[PDB]
Amino acid sequence: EFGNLARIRHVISYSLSPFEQRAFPSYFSKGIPNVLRRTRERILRVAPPFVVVYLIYTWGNQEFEQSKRKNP
Amino acid sequence: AGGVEHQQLLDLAQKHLSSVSRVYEEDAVPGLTPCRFTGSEIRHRDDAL
Numbered sequence: 001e002f003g004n005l006a007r008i009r010h011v012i013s014y015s016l017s018p019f020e021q022r023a024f025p026s027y028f029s030k031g032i033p034n035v036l037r038r039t040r041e042r043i044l045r046v047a048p049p050f051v052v053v054y055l056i057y058t059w060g061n062q063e064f065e066q067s068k069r070k071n072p
Numbered sequence: 073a074g075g076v077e078h079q080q081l082l083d084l085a086q087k088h089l090s091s092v093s094r095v096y097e098e099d100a101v102p103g104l105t106p107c108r109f110t111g112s113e114i115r116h117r118d119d120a121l
Contacts, residue, residue: 007119008117008118008119009117009118009119009120010118011116011117012114012115012116012117013113013114013115013117014112014113014114015112015113016110016111016112017110017111017112019111020110020111020112
């Protein structure tokens with residue numbers, strides 16, 4: 001509930017009207033580097049398990065296909 | 073305003089303030105430009121008050 005959540009002192013905040021400012025201010029020119037930075041920060045934690053299970057999926061499919069084949 | 077007469081005030085005003093400048097220094101008139109009103113907020117949070 002608003003008004004009794006925290007004790008804040010010596011903090012000033014400045015804003016604008018939504019009619020006084022652009023909706024998309026420097027969208028691509030500041031969005032492509034920031035998305036690239038977040039990607040650079042998170043690929044080494046996210047991607048390699050998915051790459052490993054991609055190789056597990058492909059290996060399992062080819063091993064199933066080879067076990068289908070009649071051994072001479 | 074009050075117990076004054078306009079002619080005596082004019083005679084005193086002439087005899088004293090007739091030497092106020094009217095002439096410019098750099099001859100560049102300081103314009104009084106329009107100001108842009110901006111809808112915004114400012115919030116200084118001080119809970120000790």
